[PDB]
Amino acid sequence: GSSYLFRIDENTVIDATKRGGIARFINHCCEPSCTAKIIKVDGRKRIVIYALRDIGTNEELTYDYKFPCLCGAPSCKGFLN
Amino acid sequence: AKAKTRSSRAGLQFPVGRVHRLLRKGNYAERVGAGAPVYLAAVLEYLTAEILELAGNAARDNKKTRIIPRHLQLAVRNDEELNKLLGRVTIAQGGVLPNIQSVLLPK
Amino acid sequence: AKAKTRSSRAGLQFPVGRVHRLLRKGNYAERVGAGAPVYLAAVLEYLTAEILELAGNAARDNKKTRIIPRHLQLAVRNDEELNKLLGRVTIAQGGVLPNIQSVLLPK
Amino acid sequence: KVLRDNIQGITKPAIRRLARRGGVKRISGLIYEETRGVLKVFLENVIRDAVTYTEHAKRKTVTAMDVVYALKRQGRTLYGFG
Amino acid sequence: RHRKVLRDNIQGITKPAIRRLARRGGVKRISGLIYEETRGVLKVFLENVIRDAVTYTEHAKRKTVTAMDVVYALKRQGRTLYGFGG
Amino acid sequence: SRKESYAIYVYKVLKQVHPDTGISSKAMSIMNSFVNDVFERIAGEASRLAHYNKRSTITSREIQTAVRLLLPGELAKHAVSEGTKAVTKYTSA
Amino acid sequence: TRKESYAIYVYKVLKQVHPDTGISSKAMSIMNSFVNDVFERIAGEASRLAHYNKRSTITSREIQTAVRLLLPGELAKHAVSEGTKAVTKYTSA
Amino acid sequence: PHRYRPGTVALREIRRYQKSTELLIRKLPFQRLVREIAQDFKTDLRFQSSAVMALQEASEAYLVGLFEDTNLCGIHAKRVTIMPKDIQLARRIRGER
Amino acid sequence: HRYRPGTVALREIRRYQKSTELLIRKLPFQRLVREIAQDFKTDLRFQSSAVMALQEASEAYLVGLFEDTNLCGIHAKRVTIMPKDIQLARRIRGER
DNA sequence: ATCGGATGTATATATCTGACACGTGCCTGGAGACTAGGGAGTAATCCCCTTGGCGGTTAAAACGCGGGGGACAGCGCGTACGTGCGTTTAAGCGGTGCTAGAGCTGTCTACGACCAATTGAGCGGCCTCGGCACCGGGATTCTCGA
DNA sequence: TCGAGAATCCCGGTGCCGAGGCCGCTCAATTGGTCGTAGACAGCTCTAGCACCGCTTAAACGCACGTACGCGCTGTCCCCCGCGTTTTAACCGCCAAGGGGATTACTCCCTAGTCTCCAGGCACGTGTCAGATATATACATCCGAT
Numbered sequence A: 001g002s003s004y005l006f007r008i009d010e011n012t013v014i015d016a017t018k019r020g021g022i023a024r025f026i027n028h029c030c031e032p033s034c035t036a037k038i039i040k041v042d043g044r045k046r047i048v049i050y051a052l053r054d055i056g057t058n059e060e061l062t063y064d065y066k067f068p069c070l071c072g073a074p075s076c077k078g079f080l081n
Numbered sequence B, C: 001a002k003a004k005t006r007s008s009r010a011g012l013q014f015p016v017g018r019v020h021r022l023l024r025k026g027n028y029a030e031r032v033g034a035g036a037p038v039y040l041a042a043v044l045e046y047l048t049a050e051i052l053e054l055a056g057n058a059a060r061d062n063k064k065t066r067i068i069p070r071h072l073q074l075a076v077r078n079d080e081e082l083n084k085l086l087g088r089v090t091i092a093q094g095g096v097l098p099n100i101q102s103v104l105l106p107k
Numbered sequence D: 001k002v003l004r005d006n007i008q009g010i011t012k013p014a015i016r017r018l019a020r021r022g023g024v025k026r027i028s029g030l031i032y033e034e035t036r037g038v039l040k041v042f043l044e045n046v047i048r049d050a051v052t053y054t055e056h057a058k059r060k061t062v063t064a065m066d067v068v069y070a071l072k073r074q075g076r077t078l079y080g081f082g
Numbered sequence E: 001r002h003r004k005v006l007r008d009n010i011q012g013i014t015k016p017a018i019r020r021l022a023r024r025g026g027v028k029r030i031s032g033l034i035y036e037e038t039r040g041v042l043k044v045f046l047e048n049v050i051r052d053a054v055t056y057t058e059h060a061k062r063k064t065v066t067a068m069d070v071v072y073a074l075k076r077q078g079r080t081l082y083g084f085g086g
Numbered sequence F: 001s002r003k004e005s006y007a008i009y010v011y012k013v014l015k016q017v018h019p020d021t022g023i024s025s026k027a028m029s030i031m032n033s034f035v036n037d038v039f040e041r042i043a044g045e046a047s048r049l050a051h052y053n054k055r056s057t058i059t060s061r062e063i064q065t066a067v068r069l070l071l072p073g074e075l076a077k078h079a080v081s082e083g084t085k086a087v088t089k090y091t092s093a
Numbered sequence G: 001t002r003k004e005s006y007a008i009y010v011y012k013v014l015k016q017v018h019p020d021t022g023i024s025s026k027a028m029s030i031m032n033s034f035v036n037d038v039f040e041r042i043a044g045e046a047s048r049l050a051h052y053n054k055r056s057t058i059t060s061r062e063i064q065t066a067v068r069l070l071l072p073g074e075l076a077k078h079a080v081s082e083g084t085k086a087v088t089k090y091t092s093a
Numbered sequence H: 001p002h003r004y005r006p007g008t009v010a011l012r013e014i015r016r017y018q019k020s021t022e023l024l025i026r027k028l029p030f031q032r033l034v035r036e037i038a039q040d041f042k043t044d045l046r047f048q049s050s051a052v053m054a055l056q057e058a059s060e061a062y063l064v065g066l067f068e069d070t071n072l073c074g075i076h077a078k079r080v081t082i083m084p085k086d087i088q089l090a091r092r093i094r095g096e097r
Numbered sequence I: 001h002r003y004r005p006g007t008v009a010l011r012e013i014r015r016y017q018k019s020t021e022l023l024i025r026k027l028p029f030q031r032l033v034r035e036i037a038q039d040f041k042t043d044l045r046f047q048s049s050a051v052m053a054l055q056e057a058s059e060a061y062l063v064g065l066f067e068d069t070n071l072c073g074i075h076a077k078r079v080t081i082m083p084k085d086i087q088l089a090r091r092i093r094g095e096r
Numbered sequence J: 001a002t003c004g005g006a007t008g009t010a011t012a013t014a015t016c017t018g019a020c021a022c023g024t025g026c027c028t029g030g031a032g033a034c035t036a037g038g039g040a041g042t043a044a045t046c047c048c049c050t051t052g053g054c055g056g057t058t059a060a061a062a063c064g065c066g067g068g069g070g071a072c073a074g075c076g077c078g079t080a081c082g083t084g085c086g087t088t089t090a091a092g093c094g095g096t097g098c099t100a101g102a103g104c105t106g107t108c109t110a111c112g113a114c115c116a117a118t119t120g121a122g123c124g125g126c127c128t129c130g131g132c133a134c135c136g137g138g139a140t141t142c143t144c145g146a
Numbered sequence K: 001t002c003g004a005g006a007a008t009c010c011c012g013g014t015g016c017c018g019a020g021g022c023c024g025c026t027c028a029a030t031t032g033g034t035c036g037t038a039g040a041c042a043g044c045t046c047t048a049g050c051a052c053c054g055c056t057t058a059a060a061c062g063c064a065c066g067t068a069c070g071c072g073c074t075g076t077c078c079c080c081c082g083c084g085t086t087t088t089a090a091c092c093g094c095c096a097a098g099g100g101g102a103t104t105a106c107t108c109c110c111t112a113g114t115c116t117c118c119a120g121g122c123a124c125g126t127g128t129c130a131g132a133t134a135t136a137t138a139c140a141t142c143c144g145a146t
Ligand SMILES: C[S@@+](CC[C@H](N)C(=O)[O-])C[C@H]1O[C@@H](n2cnc3c(N)ncnc32)[C@H](O)[C@@H]1O
Pocket: A001, A002, A003, A004, A024, A025, A026, A027, A028, A029, A030, A068, A069, A070, A071, A079, A080
């Protein structure tokens, strides 16, 4: 019950069910605090998660997914989509 | 590691041959010690490594491979220590740090 | 005029013996020319004469014979082209130039 | 030929294009004569020390390094030209 | 003999001594919040000078911050001080 | 004529930290003129420390104390420790 | 042992232009320290200027072109004329 | 018509020009401005073509470093304009004139 | 008899601009220098003419800041300096 | 406009003091003679780069217009900084003691200058190709009048 | 709180040259030797910095108070932004030409180095004189009341 894939280009994904980094663990919130631009490092594209705003000490990060909203935020759409 | 090319004896990539020449026919003091160009070539390695780490770091954000001078001002002015070191300087054809004073931003 | 003491051959009161010593064991260049300490001792005569003209000049305005350091800041900051030369400097125990901004003066 | 009033070629948008890089929002129109009274003051200091480094070297061409030494004199530097 | 960790000697730069430095600058009315701000700007100026003033002695292998080395510390920051030699 | 530079020596440090990226020829002349500037501030400052103390040698101790005068804060502490790491490879081997 | 100064060579030029006027001991130490500072500005600037043209000699021509850089304006037009007067009166005499 | 409000051609052209490198003063009114000021010090001086651009880049990056200092000195008076009683403040603070 | 708000100050300015003694006292300033120098070495020993050279160089800087605090507080059309005036004069000069 | 105090400020003696201008001794750094020598001047070539011109093309500046908002004056409030009066609490001082460190002398060992003898990394030159300029479709989105 | 609008973003294809990779090739790097001398020792003398104490009071400290200045909130008008249309000179890409920079090659004369000399000027001991407190005072700016 978790969508542990990703997309680099439309042909291939980055799975994160069994393998992966610690980068998978951050969840959805419709208000963003992180995005992930796709950069290329030496012919193959890693996926790198920057920040948008000044995140504080132990301030829980967000991420938009852009394909309910259990964040508890009001200023959001009530679903994922 | 090696015997020739003193940099390789020290483990640097900057020449200790050229730096020991440029401490004598630059006329800085009478008699430069033998350890002195080694220490100086290591520091000039490290500050060049500290810039070109941060330069290509913000080359990746731009998404370009090679480093243009615009990436160097973004590596220098974004970093406080480097900024202090390069306080007076102007990097040619290098833009500015993108900021607006936030009074001027709209309501 | 004379033969000994090369300042007296030049007509200065600053020593050209000491200045020619301090251009070799100060390590400024390799080989200092013979005319070079003469020209330099004349300039250091003239700037010392330009200050001590204006220093004792403003000692007569405060009516004292000898020059205290307060007279030196009044000779330097009142000048128009010694203030540019001694721009960075702070003359120790020397006060400031007496001025008020004239908005603050009464009606 | 001996020229005058070339400083009005630093034209009214090109002061305001420069001022946007400083990040200013509204520019009162008296700025455009104060700024040309500042660029002329600044270029008189740089070129007169740049001519002096050529006059010593017995040349008739202000080369690239002789501005960079004239900028290193005043407390700026220029990385990029030598 | 006495291990005194000295703290709050900054409160000896007193409120009627920042008034008289204000007067020699030629300013008229001072706020109430200047007095805990000038001490923030005094402790920044003294930190930069003494850190260079110690380094000049620590290299010279002494335990005295002599007045040639304070003058050289001020000369490096472009605030030359005439009156103690150099 | 032979006008030397630090052109190839910067290039061997770019192909250590970022082994795929390149560098422009304008941003080579900045790093060629960066190294020519931190030289004259380190050997410029360590020609006063070996003159105020009436020494006559730029030893390897002044270039330590030149670096702790110029370089601010945590670039001083890392470049000092990059120095003595690299002069001790020189003295032993 | 002995510490040299510019104390006496100031003192003759004080009695030259103000022949009744004395000076203090604190305000001699400023005028001692001022002469040492105009030295290391001028001989500093006339050393880099010897290096930039790849000569190795501070001749009289450099200190004409180092006074003309540091000294701002009307002091430059005087102290050049006060120099070349005194380099003729050394050479011809 | 579709009218842009007074204020957001400015805050577009701030974010355009701060995200760009290239020269903002045209070169031919800077080639003939430098040759005006050099003609009062030494007559008939040629210029190397790099030594115009070394003067342009050190003057474009001076006036930008001036206009970042007037705009702090203008916001200080609760304004958003910049007047010439700001440039004559931000030069007087920095010890220029 | 309770002379006016403001003109004790202009009598206070003209006294202090025409005088040249040191304004911060000697003994509290000598304990400030021996507090700040504890971070950079322990048991230092200041030569006692280098706690004058740290005084006459420091209050000739604080005075030179209040001459540039006052020029920008006049610029905001008031006569009262404030801590949003000081941090302009340090920022424009390039201490930040 | 101007009074009435009035009160600190700047204008005159007094006279003591310890800062300074001065007089003896000496010593070390400055002056001359002259030596070899290399660094700079002075010719010479030579060709690279700057000055000049022009014929385009057109981005960009110059100009004028409306309209909008930001500056600036005014006014009123309320608060907090100044003024002073009264009162503490160190600073300054001078004085004596004490000693840790600064300075100097002198030995004496490591070590950088310098020389030649060798050479191999580094610069210049030449090929080459891919990273980015440079434009087109569309998708978002960023504002604003609906 | 939004649908039309438009600038930006972005992703694409096609082309350019300038970054990168080598080929030869010289001079600068290496080194392996001498050579004295700079710095590194201990060592010693001493002086200057630190610790303390008693005092004397100048200055900080606190409070009360009233007052003027900051601030905020207005309205105004002016002047700066926005934009369309016309205008013009920047730009690019030619040309060509020659001045001046750059190097080479003799040549020479200035100066570095060494020695021989000696008095300039350094520190010291000296009296003395221009100060700064110590003191009453004539009057400039300031103030409550008129
Ligand atoms: C992409 S994975 C996120 C990583 C996962 N939550 C973890 O920490 O292992 C998707 C998971 O996030 C949760 N999720 C998706 N949208 C969410 C939202 N808007 N608020 C809270 N949780 C959300 C879902 O339950 C789903 O299992």
